[PDB]
Amino acid sequence: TVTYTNRVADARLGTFSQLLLQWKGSIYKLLYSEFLIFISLYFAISLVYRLILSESQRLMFEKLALYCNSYAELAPVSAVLGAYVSLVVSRWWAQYESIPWPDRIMNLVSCNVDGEDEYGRLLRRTLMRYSNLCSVLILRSVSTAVYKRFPSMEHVVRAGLMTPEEHKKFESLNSPHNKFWIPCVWFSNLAVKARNEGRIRDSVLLQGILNELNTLRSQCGRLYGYDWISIPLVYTQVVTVAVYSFFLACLIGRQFLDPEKAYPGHELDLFVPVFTFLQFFFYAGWLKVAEQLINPFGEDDDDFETNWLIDRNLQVSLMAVDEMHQDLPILEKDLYWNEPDPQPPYTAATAEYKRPSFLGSTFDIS
Amino acid sequence: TVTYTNRVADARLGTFSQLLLQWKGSIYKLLYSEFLIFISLYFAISLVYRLILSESQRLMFEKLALYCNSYAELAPVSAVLGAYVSLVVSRWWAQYESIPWPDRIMNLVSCNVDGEDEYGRLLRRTLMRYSNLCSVLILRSVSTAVYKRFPSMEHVVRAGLMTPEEHKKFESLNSPHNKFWIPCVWFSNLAVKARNEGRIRDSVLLQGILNELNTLRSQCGRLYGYDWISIPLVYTQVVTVAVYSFFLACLIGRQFLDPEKAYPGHELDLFVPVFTFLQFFFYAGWLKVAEQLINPFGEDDDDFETNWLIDRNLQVSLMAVDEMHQDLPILEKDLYWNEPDPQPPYTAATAEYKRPSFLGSTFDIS
Amino acid sequence: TVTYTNRVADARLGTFSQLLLQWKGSIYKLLYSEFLIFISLYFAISLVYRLILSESQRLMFEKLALYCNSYAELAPVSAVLGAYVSLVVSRWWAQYESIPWPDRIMNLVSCNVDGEDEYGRLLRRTLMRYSNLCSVLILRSVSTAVYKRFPSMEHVVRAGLMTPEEHKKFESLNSPHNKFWIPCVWFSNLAVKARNEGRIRDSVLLQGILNELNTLRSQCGRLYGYDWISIPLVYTQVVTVAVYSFFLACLIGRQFLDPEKAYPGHELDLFVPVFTFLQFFFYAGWLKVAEQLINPFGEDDDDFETNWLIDRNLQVSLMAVDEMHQDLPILEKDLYWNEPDPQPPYTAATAEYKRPSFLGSTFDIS
């Protein structure tokens, strides 16, 4: 979604430093408001201490800052943050791999639903659309980016993802629960009807198509599960309390105290707490990692591109089962027909990558 | 890719020490430039303090160094680095196991696509090439090492991985998305056509070949996913900010202060911060682990050898379905035909490894 | 169960702060009683020290508080807590994914059990009910929320999940063990009988239905395993001993000592230990995470909604195999019949999400 994969392909001098200059989906963009509020509260307190407090009040503030500073300890924050963010990242990738792709069903429907006639074409196209509909229905239930594009079931119809008859049949089935599973049932019935009409040879080929359907259903279920079962609220609150406890301590504890009073640890007054602000970006930015990935189907820069996926799948799906049904290129003899040990060429820049075969660690390299 | 597996086979005296003398894919090669910049910035600051600053300025620098040194804390860096590098290492191995291997399809196509005639040969060879093409297409999309070898679809054709007719059919199919999935559809269609021509006996055998194809498609999808879905940028920036914050503190904090002033902790002046430089190799090298494996398909020393894999797969693939179709050695009686409990020999060096059968922990060893 | 997924969809200013104002399934609701007892014991001790102890006794208390405070170390608690809570969270999600869903069997039974006559209808409905019964039986064995709804096998019958004849057959089978597996056997027998009556065409389709049944059985087994095999008691006691040891130390160690005596670290008297109470919410709330998820089938706010699942599954199950058996909508040509590269519309708010196809990191974006 914010892909920088090609920038970090090699481990060169500025592989990671270069990324500090990027704004899209960056730490600056996510921390902006929070950082400013921190900056303000800090320098506000700083001026109150330098310009308002009396000599006697300043002595109390200095004693209060020493108290607060002794409680700004990251080690407990690092512990709970690391674990929580690890949990979020785990679910984040699991949710991605749970986005259903048509390609596996697409391959079977394209080759095993017979007929080069309009009905065979309508049959194959309708089967794929039942798959894409099972997906679009669940995606608009879990993704705010998709829902805002299909806010009502009418949008789904007008977008060409569901026919008005299907919508009628959809409404006809009375159920109080999410009907995303309906197209998945239609598919199995239509696949069986297709087999009875002789469009699907065996039951082995039919069950094979039914299996890939069931797999797609399990994908939609996983998406439903992660949307329904949030990370327990108590856990989320714990990590924000811990993080905020730290920044609360820093607000006062990290104040630059009087250099003249010579407090151990506060010998220099820089006015601006460089390292405390660097700690804020670290921990507030670290919390923002979880903050952004806790729901990867939202509208964040790094949230999944669910609407593009829908478009790509629609185009590719139909194309593979229609224009490509039993449509192959001209079979030719391959360029290595009479060559048992082909030696495919290398460009000038890639010849260093033509390596001898790795036989095993145990063998002597001679 | 940089395999030292045989060197670390045994846990001897210098099993790991020996590896500190290796340059290829080493910590020295990856840290070289960064270390020099650190070295320079350090000793530059060191000379400014020893030779330029006035007695009064030196006192401020010493107070500034005590401030910076109090913020060079590795514990928070260790937390975020360990977690981040673990995530990178996790994806690193997942991407490797996502590199498709022909061997499973290779075994089925070689034995279940009938015919010892030129067509049967062309059929089997074309089926394998559709698999290898599905792979090469995705590999050149995710690997810079491969792309620089196949920068254009013409390179793929001229290299013998795609026929010009296939390229024509390829172009004929209008789609704005990556067509790496095309050969995977052709395969299923060609496998079905082969079955209708009587070259594949049952549908059980056909579905079995279609399944191994779908698995290969899922492999290509995983590669696409890891290339598309980068580790969230904010997370990457967080760990570089944390690491750099530490080295910023060390640049000044780890300066050798005046021994005469007798600062607690700074009683000895060695001019060269041995342990601080050793800490740099540790953390900068630890960050380089993630820096190198975050994209294992690049051109790093330890990045995957994707071009060799392509070559090996091409050679082995065709060879197994052509020269090896229904081609077996002469069936003989095995050397242990009349021996129910064979006792295979051992070399002189390996006799210590002939052990009695492990029956279970519960049994008395007598 | 306490779903806030939509609130945390985007990483905005108050994404996580907002959740601190929520009561249901919150840290406040789970810690309430414990916190009050801590508060009381603390201020109780505080008053005894300020108002009861003599000048000589106060000096001992101050020496005792310095001793206790030196043992309030979070680092060892963070270690064991983080690990333990991670184990609980791991099992927590594994148990969720082990809750059986009818949808996969539902799809096969609806399309592969032939007959539009009352028997075909009774056959399909009875097959699904044998599945839902296998589930309801195990759920009421592991979930207190479900058991309190089906305390006796009569409740199961009167609720319409088991017929009185089935209950008679149930009792007839003499076994001292949990009979949740019985309906799962009936299903396989009824599925075979259905095939012999010609209601299930092939064995390929029959084995396919038997496989999805076995999968559901494995789901029930996982639920049984997690209920039977608790997290080892010694481990649970260890983490509570560690946590309580910390709060025991804090009860005395974190007392506000005499400011006049000028103890290093105790220069300011605030009467209320703000940061110690913030540490209590952190660790006591962190322990409550494990405390709540160690049995996700209980009656906690964030415990699974097992009774709703039963209701939803009952409704959807029967509906898909009865009203939807071979019942499809009118096949129409799709809106993109003559459009090879469809461009589904976007709402005004979602047009920014229409992206160009991601081809791969290696390709030049031009």
């Epitope: 460009t347 033509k354 | 920068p151 | 030049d364």
Partner: antibody, heavy 109, light 106 residues
């Protein structure tokens, strides 16, 4: 049709610098590496270097390290080569060729 | 670097004849060799690539062979057009050095 149109002939005084062009057309500029060859009468063709149009990665010949410079303009589909500290020996015919495991299209020179 | 040694420096033959130019590699270059034809004043043109494969326009009378370190171009049944310059180039690595050349005169 693939066509590599280079700049016109040049005349400079020793020590100066020159920058010749090569405009490609009829194929995707960024998908083929561009090479530069030096042709002197009586000597064999010398390989100066190559350039990756996409990322402007240059790979020169050690023999031309300080003499030649490569860069491209993806927008105008043209490649450039700059020769510095020109001497009498830097006088020759300079080609730009497209690579596809071979040099299948050269410029006029 | 890989050294390309071409021979003969110049061959003289008349129409109808069949000549054979030879390029020898300093080290193994597998099948990575190309043959170019260059007529005085014009820019070179690709004849054979990948050691054996003829390019588009090349007539059947041209054929290449060899592998490893020994390659050869063979022009059977000469024509008037076939008179001019001929050189080889290896394509195994960087820099892709060229051959000395061969002047084919009448």
């Amino acid at each position: 049709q693939v066509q590599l149109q280079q700049s016109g002939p040049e005349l400079v005084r020793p020590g100066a610098s020159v920058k010749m062009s090569c405009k490609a057309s009829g194929y995707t500029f960024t998908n083929y590496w561009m090479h530069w060859v030096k042709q002197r009468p009586g000597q064999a063709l010398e390989w100066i270097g190559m350039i990756d149009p996409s990322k402007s990665e240059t790979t020169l010949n050690q023999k031309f390290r300080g003499k030649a410079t490569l860069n491209v303009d993806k927008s105008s589909n043209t490649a450039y080569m700059q020769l510095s500290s020109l001497t009498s020996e830097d006088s020759a015919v300079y080609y730009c060729a497209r690579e596809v495991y071979y040099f299948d299209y050269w410029g006029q020179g | 670097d890989i050294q390309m040694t071409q021979s003969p420096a110049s061959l003289s033959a008349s129409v109808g004849e069949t000549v054979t130019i030879t390029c020898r590699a300093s080290e193994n270059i597998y099948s990575y060799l190309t043959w170019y034809q260059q007529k005085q004043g014009k820019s070179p043109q690709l004849l054979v690539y990948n050691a054996k494969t003829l390019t588009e326009g090349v007539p059947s009378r041209f054929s290449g062979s060899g592998s490893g370190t020994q390659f050869s171009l063979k022009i059977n049944s000469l024509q008037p057009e076939d008179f001019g310059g001929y050189f080889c180039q290896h394509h195994y690595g960087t820099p892709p050095t060229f051959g000395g050349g061969t002047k084919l005169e009448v």
